């Protein structure tokens, strides 16, 4: 369980890029600050759903 | 949204220049181990661990806040690269 | 009734029995990630 | 006739009036005829952007909020208050929008 | 484990109260009842009625005074009154002013054990030749009671006022996810409380939880009548209202009792005797 | 004008169902009391559930038993419906044994009786057995709260034992009704009626009491506003190893070690007592 805490420490302040095909415009890729969650699914913010 | 992003965009004629300044400053901080910071002990960015408040590992955050303070000077042809690097290594060894 | 508050929903709501199927597309099968790994022979680029 | 928004919404909380009911409410020195709901929307914006006067300027209170009015709101907020504040306002609009959408029936 | 309770307050008007960590679902389980109680059941004071000398009704307008009756009542609704005496349930404030003056809350005639929390509160602007004479009724109560509901009038021409008793102006609560290392589904509760300053947010909260607990405690314990005799009317009324209603009691009435009755004399004694001749 | 303590009425049918009335209450308090109790009753009420299953000559859940109609998955599914009542409050786990054969339909009664263990639903079907069919199994039932999936607890009494999804909550259903009532002068008053359906292991009144107790205990949390390991002490290495492996790992325990305890340790003598004393000189 300590390695998960370590992983929380690692990703601190860093962001990841989300992409959805087809990528029609530059907002087809966006940057998000990741919040670690249980489960195998990626969680996306509602407001960006239109751009993607 | 990143804190004071509009004001940061204010400081530059081009957003990409802001990005370059932030990135390079972050490289300086990483290289010299944060001991060359312009921040004050109470201005230092913090991170909550299980233990408690610790220094923020992220150098980009540091660089952006430092830039927001105004104590940093950025531009083109301010100083030869070698001289800068050596003076920095003299003031803050590795 | 809203289970959180206990107060009812401000309007009447359609409730009934529906037939719903679970499809063959499941996250467990589709979740994947890679740091480093196998590369291609000629291109030396990562595999698919 | 309500002296302030807090009174109107306190009345709504006790089921005296609904959010869609037209009522006389005194807000920012002027006597207005509107629903507690729209006042609530104005407070949502106000707290979201942390500027009450500018928020009051942006909102169209005499009309029901829809896609176009809200889009105009977002744009004006972007022009006046900048990126960060508009983002906060967006999150607020999302939160309260959903919250009311579920209980709406 | 035992959750931490943190309190951050700004003056007497506003407060934030954080409770974490809590078991899943308990955020709203605690959050909802407290919100309901704080808005409804927290004791306070409010202006319930107003009498103005030359004002006939609520929609009238006062000569010499800028504000209409509606605006004046509205300002009086903003009046925060603190009772020092716990047993004191009602006070009548008197106000008399004239001339070119701006009337504040201080101008109200001082009453013992009654403290005005907002003496800077504006009521009405008076001009040259303007005369304002009014009496405001302050009561102790709970929650929000509209004027139409209580309908209390101390005198004629009195205008009933919507009563906002609750010193608590606003209650909001946010519940967000939190983690204890291995478990991530824990609840974090954040309570935001706005008050008028008469009662403190922490005090109000404490009263609310105390009320709720007190409510939780409630689950613990799971020879015939003269009126019919047909005697004289005077006999009926007198004898009846004289504490007796039967011939048995009439029998109990001795010589210094029957004749002692204010109604009874001889005309009555006659009829009575006749009755005792009919029954024996 | 202050309301007084309301009358509380109780109507129970067996151990499975209950109604609890509180009236009169102030307007709006019907749901104020009624709703949170419902949430707690559904979530936080302690109960019993089958946490493990071992069937003889059965290696896993997807196996099949000769002579038995139902598959192992279906058998475990049937076992999930088993309601087990512990009479002893201190009993946190029990292992039930069952042995049956021949042309018989195995019910819950067939389980070998255990002291302080009552089966509330003995009519529950488990498996249909044929001629030559043999069912010999041990199920482990534990006490717990809420819902713990098989993957979460991973309880195995033995190797071939199959972990079972544990549905601990004894409370099957909770509903509450708020109705109009009057106390002579005041109208629009609230009458609260709580209806509770349980599996019989815990009584509706007991469940309600536990719920109210939980709510109260949680309400207490609004009260307050706002001993080190020897291994870390930095003591001598010999001290570390000896003291540690000697059944203690802290200065509290070192303090507990009296004169006829510390000096009794095989490793400890005088060289150790020195360092120890120094440590007690650094902290006091």
**A positions 11-40 inside 8 Å of B (CB):** 12-14
The SS3 of residue F53 is: strand
Inter-residue contact F29 to E214 (CB < 8 Å): no
Residues E238 and E241: their CA atoms lie apart, in Å, by: 5
- Are C3 and F34 within 8 A, CB to CB? no
Nearest to D43 by CA among D96, D103, D2, D102: D96
Backbone Cα Rg of chain E: 32
Cross-strand pairs, F101? F134
The domain defined by F47-168 carries CATH number 3.40.718.10: no
Residue F68 DSSP class: B
Chain centre distance of CA F123: 25
Inter-residue contact F128 to F105 (CB < 8 Å): yes
Q: What is the fold, at CATH topology level, of the domain defined by E44-165?
A: RNA Polymerase Alpha Subunit; Chain A, domain 2 (2.170.120)
Q: Which two tokens stand for residue E41?
A: 């059941």
Residues F266 and A3: their CA atoms lie apart, in Å, by: 39
Nearest to E116 by CA among E105, E125, E127, E126: E105
Secondary-structure percent of chain C, ordered helix, strand, coil, rounded to 5: 10, 5, 90
Chain centre distance of CA F121: 20
Residues in chain F: 284
Residues F100 and F112: their CA atoms lie apart, in Å, by: 11
Inter-residue contact E135 to E51 (CB < 8 Å): yes
Inter-residue contact B39 to B33 (CB < 8 Å): no
Contacts 24+ apart (CB under 8 A), E67-76: E67/E123, E67/E124, E67/E125, E69/E159, E70/D1, E71/D31, E71/E124, E72/E123, E72/E124, E73/E159, E73/E161, E74/D1, E74/D3, E74/D26, E75/D3, E75/E121, E75/E122, E75/E123, E75/E124, E76/E47, E76/E50, E76/E123, E76/E136, E76/E161
Residues B16 and B22: their CA atoms lie apart, in Å, by: 10
User: Does the CB of D105 have a partner CB in chain C at under 8 Å?
Assistant: yes
Taking CA E44 as the corner, what is the angle to CA E42 and CA E47, rounded to the nearest 5 degrees? 140
Cross-strand pairs, F171? F198
The SS3 of residue F117 is: strand
Kindly state the helix (H) or strand (E) to which residue D77 belongs, with its residue range. Answer: helix D67-81
Residue F122 DSSP class: T
List C-alpha distances in Å: F177 to B87, E219, F10, F21: 79, 16, 15, 9
- Are B6 and D82 within 8 A, CB to CB? yes
Residues D99 and D104: their CA atoms lie apart, in Å, by: 9
Residue A22 preceded by cis peptide, ω within 30: yes
Q: Do chains B and F touch (3 or more CB pairs under 8 A)?
A: no
- What's the gap in Å between the CA of D52 and the closest CA on chain C? 30
Q: Which two tokens stand for residue F113?
A: 């009786």
Q: What is the dihedral of CA F153, F158, F162, F168, to 10 degrees?
A: -40
10 Å Cβ neighbour count for D16? Answer: 18
- Residue labelled with tokens 């919404």: D9
Beta strands in B1-94 (DSSP E): 46-48, 53-55
Taking CA F32 as the corner, what is the angle to CA F148 and CA C5, rounded to the nearest 5 degrees? 55
**C to D CB pairs, distance under 8 Å:** 12
Find, in chain A, the residue whose alpha carbon is nearest to that of C29: A40
The residues near A3 (Cβ < 8 Å, ≥ 6 apart) are none
Cross-strand pairs, F196? F18, F174
Residues F200 and F118: their CA atoms lie apart, in Å, by: 10
User: Does the CB of A50 have a partner CB in chain E at under 8 Å?
Assistant: no
List C-alpha distances in Å: F173 to E219, E242, F196: 20, 64, 6
Q: Quick one: angle between helices D36-49 and D5-13, nearest 10?
A: 120
Residue F127 preceded by cis peptide, ω within 30: no
Which residues of B fall within a CB distance of 8 Å from D88? 1
- Residue labelled with tokens 């927290």: E42
The SS3 of residue D21 is: coil
Inter-residue contact F197 to F41 (CB < 8 Å): no
Chain centre distance of CA E27: 33
**E positions 224-243 inside 8 Å of C (CB):** none
Inter-residue contact D18 to D103 (CB < 8 Å): no
Q: Which two tokens stand for residue B73?
A: 């000077």
Q: Do chains E and C touch (3 or more CB pairs under 8 A)?
A: yes
Residue F24 preceded by cis peptide, ω within 30: yes
For chain D, report the end-to-end CA distance as a whole number of angstroms: 28
Q: What is the fold, at CATH topology level, of the domain defined by F3-46+169-222?
A: Gyrase A; domain 2 (3.30.1360)
Residues E149 and E142: their CA atoms lie apart, in Å, by: 14
Q: Which two tokens stand for residue F283?
A: 């902290």
Residue D3 DSSP class: S
The SS3 of residue F153 is: helix
Residue D15 DSSP class: T
Inter-residue contact F127 to F106 (CB < 8 Å): yes
- What's the gap in Å between the CA of D103 and the closest CA on chain A? 19
Within chain F, residue ranges assigned H as helices are: 29-43, 72-79, 150-153, 204-219, 230-233, 237-245, 251-256, 259-262, 271-283
Residues D1 and D25: their CA atoms lie apart, in Å, by: 6
φ, ψ of residue F283 to 5 degrees: the values are -100, -45
Q: Which two tokens stand for residue E70?
A: 């509606």
Residues F197 and F17: their CA atoms lie apart, in Å, by: 5
The residues near E236 (Cβ < 8 Å, ≥ 6 apart) are E226, E227
Chain centre distance of CA E190: 31
List C-alpha distances in Å: E26 to C14, E193, F221: 28, 19, 12
User: Does the CB of D82 have a partner CB in chain B at under 8 Å?
Assistant: yes
Kindly state the helix (H) or strand (E) to which residue F169 belongs, with its residue range. Answer: none
Q: Which two tokens stand for residue B64?
A: 């952006």
Inter-residue contact E82 to E198 (CB < 8 Å): yes
Q: Which two tokens stand for residue F182?
A: 């009057």
Residues E80 and B44: their CA atoms lie apart, in Å, by: 44
The residues near D86 (Cβ < 8 Å, ≥ 6 apart) are D49, D74, D77, D78
Kindly state the helix (H) or strand (E) to which residue C37 belongs, with its residue range. Answer: none
Residues E156 and F179: their CA atoms lie apart, in Å, by: 38
Inter-residue contact A36 to A11 (CB < 8 Å): yes
Q: Which two tokens stand for residue E63?
A: 């000569």
List C-alpha distances in Å: B86 to B75, B80, B93, E104: 19, 10, 9, 71
User: Does the CB of C6 have a partner CB in chain D at under 8 Å?
Assistant: no
Chain centre distance of CA F1: 45
- Using CA of residue D17, residue D19, residue D21, residue D23, what is the dihedral sign? positive
The answer to whether F3-46+169-222 and F47-168 have equal CATH topology is: no
User: Does the CB of D22 have a partner CB in chain E at under 8 Å?
Assistant: no
Q: Which two tokens stand for residue E123?
A: 């009521």
10 Å Cβ neighbour count for C41? Answer: 5
Pairing mode, strands F17-25 and F104-107: unpaired
Inter-residue contact E89 to E140 (CB < 8 Å): yes
Identify how the structure was determined: X-ray
Nearest to D58 by CA among D37, D80, D36: D80
Residues E238 and E227: their CA atoms lie apart, in Å, by: 10
DSSP code string of C10-23: SS------------
Nearest to F218 by CA among D18, A36, E21: E21
Residue F209, judged by CB atoms within 10 A of its CB (0-12, 13-18, 19+), counts as middle
Q: What is the fold, at CATH topology level, of the domain defined by B1-94?
A: Eukaryotic RPB6 RNA polymerase subunit (3.90.940)
Inter-residue contact B65 to B29 (CB < 8 Å): no
Cross-strand pairs, E124? E103
- Are C5 and F39 within 8 A, CB to CB? no
The SS3 of residue F167 is: strand
Residue A27 DSSP class: G
User: Does the CB of D6 have a partner CB in chain E at under 8 Å?
Assistant: yes
The SS3 of residue F242 is: helix
Task: Nearest by CB to A14, from B49, B50, B58: name it.
Answer: B58
Q: Which two tokens stand for residue A18?
A: 């989300």
- Are B50 and A14 within 8 A, CB to CB? no
Inter-residue contact E132 to E126 (CB < 8 Å): yes
10 Å Cβ neighbour count for F104? Answer: 14
Residues F185 and F3: their CA atoms lie apart, in Å, by: 11
Inter-residue contact B69 to B43 (CB < 8 Å): yes
Nearest to F215 by CA among E28, E38, E213: E213
User: Does the CB of F35 have a partner CB in chain E at under 8 Å?
Assistant: yes
Which residues of D fall within a CB distance of 8 Å from A46? 94
- Using CA of residue F76, residue F77, residue F79, residue F80, what is the dihedral sign? positive
Q: Domain map of chain B by residue range?
A: 1-94
The SS3 of residue F87 is: coil
Buried b (16+ CB within 10 A) or exposed e, C6-33: beeeeeeeeeeeeeeeeeeeeeeeeeee
Q: Domain map of chain F by residue range?
A: 3-46+169-222, 47-168
DSSP code string of F20-45: EEEEEE-TTHHHHHHHHHHHHHHHT-
- Residue labelled with tokens 């205990």: F217
φ, ψ of residue E133 to 5 degrees: the values are -130, 110
DSSP code string of chain E: -PPEEEEEEETTTEEEEEEEEE-TTHHHHHHHHHHHHHHHTSEEEEEEEEEETT--STT---TTBSS-HHHHHHHHHT--EEESSTT--EEEEEEEEESSEEEEGGGSPP-TTEEES-TT-EEEEE-TT-EEEEEEEEEEEESEE-HHHH---SSTTPEE--EE--SEEEEEEEEEEEEETTEEEEEEEEEEEEE-SSS-HHHHHHHHHHHHHHHHGGGS----BHHHHT--HHHHHHHHHTT--BHHHHHH--HHHHTTSSS-SSHHHHHHHHHHHHH-
CATH of domain E1-43+166-219: 3.30.1360.10
- What's the gap in Å between the CA of C6 and the closest CA on chain E? 9
Instruction: Tell how many helices (H) and how many strands (E) occur in chain A.
Output: 1, 2
Kindly state the helix (H) or strand (E) to which residue B74 belongs, with its residue range. Answer: none
Inter-residue contact F48 to F86 (CB < 8 Å): yes
The residues near D52 (Cβ < 8 Å, ≥ 6 apart) are D28, D46
Instruction: Tell how many helices (H) and how many strands (E) occur in chain C.
Output: 1, 0
10 Å Cβ neighbour count for F103? Answer: 11
Inter-residue contact E30 to E205 (CB < 8 Å): no
Q: Which two tokens stand for residue E127?
A: 């001009």
**A to C CB pairs, distance under 8 Å:** 6
């Amino acid at each position: 369980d300590e390695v998960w805490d370590a992983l929380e420490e690692v990703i601190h302040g860093k962001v990841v890029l989300l992409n959805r095909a087809p990528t029609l415009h530059r907002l087809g890729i966006q940057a998000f600050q990741p919040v670690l969650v249980e489960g195998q699914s990626i969680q996306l913010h509602p407001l960006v759903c239109e751009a993607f | 949204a990143e804190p004071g992003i509009d004001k940061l965009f204010g400081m530059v004629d081009s957003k990409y220049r802001l990005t370059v300044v932030v990135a390079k400053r972050a490289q300086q901080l990483l290289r010299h181990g944060f001991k060359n910071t312009v921040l004050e002990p109470e201005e230092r960015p913090k991170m909550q661990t299980l233990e408690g408040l610790f220094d923020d590992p992220n150098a980009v955050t540091w660089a952006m806040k430092e830039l927001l303070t105004g104590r940093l000077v950025f531009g083109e042809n301010l100083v030869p690269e070698d001289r800068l690097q050596k003076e920095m290594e003299r003031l803050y060894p590795v | 009734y809203d289970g959180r508050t206990g107060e009812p929903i401000e309007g009447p709501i359609v409730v009934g029995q529906m037939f719903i199927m679970k499809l063959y597309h499941m996250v467990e099968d589709k979740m994947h990630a890679r740091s480093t790994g196998p590369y291609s022979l000629i291109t030396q680029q990562p595999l698919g | 006739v309500f002296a302030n928004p807090d009174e109107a919404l306190l009345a709504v909380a006790h089921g005296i009036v609904d959010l869609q009911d037209v009522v006389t409410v005194r807000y920012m020195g002027k006597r207005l005829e509107t629903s507690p709901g729209r006042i609530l929307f104005a407070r949502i914006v106000a707290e979201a952007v942390e500027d009450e006067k500018v928020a009051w300027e942006l909102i169209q209170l005499d009309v029901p909020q829809e896609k176009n009015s809200l889009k105009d709101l977002v744009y004006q907020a972007f022009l006046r208050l900048g990126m960060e504040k508009t983002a906060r306002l967006l999150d607020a609009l999302k939160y309260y929008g959903f919250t009311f959408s579920t209980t709406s029936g | 484990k035992a959750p931490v309770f943190t309190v951050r307050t700004q003056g007497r008007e506003y407060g934030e109260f954080v409770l974490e960590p809590l078991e899943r679902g308990f955020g709203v389980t605690l959050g909802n009842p407290l919100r309901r109680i704080l808005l409804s059941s927290i004791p306070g004071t409010a202006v319930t009625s107003v009498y103005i000398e030359d004002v006939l009704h609520e929609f009238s307008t006062i000569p010499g005074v800028k504000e209409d009756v509606v605006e004046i009542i509205l300002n009086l609704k903003e009046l925060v009154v603190r009772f020092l005496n716990p047993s004191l349930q009602t006070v009548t404030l008197l106000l008399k002013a004239e001339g070119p003056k701006e009337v504040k809350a201080r101008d109200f005639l001082p009453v013992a054990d009654v403290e005005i929390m907002n003496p800077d509160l504006h009521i009405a602007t008076l001009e040259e030749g303007g005369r304002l004479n009014m009496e405001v009724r302050v009561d102790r109560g709970v929650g929000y009671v509209p004027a139409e509901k209580h309908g209390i009038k101390d005198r004629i021409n009195a205008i009933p006022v919507d009563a906002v008793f609750s010193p608590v102006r606003r209650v909001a609560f946010q519940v967000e996810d939190t983690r204890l290392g291995q478990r991530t589904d824990l609840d974090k509760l954040t309570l935001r409380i706005w008050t008028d300053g008469s009662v403190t947010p922490l005090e109000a909260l404490n009263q609310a939880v105390e009320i709720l607990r007190e409510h939780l405690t409630y689950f613990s314990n799971p020879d015939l009548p003269l009126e019919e005799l047909g005697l004289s009317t005077r006999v009926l009324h007198s004898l009846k209202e004289e504490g007796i209603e039967s011939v048995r009691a009439l029998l109990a009435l001795n010589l210094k009792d029957l004749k002692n009755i204010p109604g009874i004399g001889e005309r009555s004694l006659e009829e009575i005797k006749e009755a005792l001749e009919k029954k024996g």
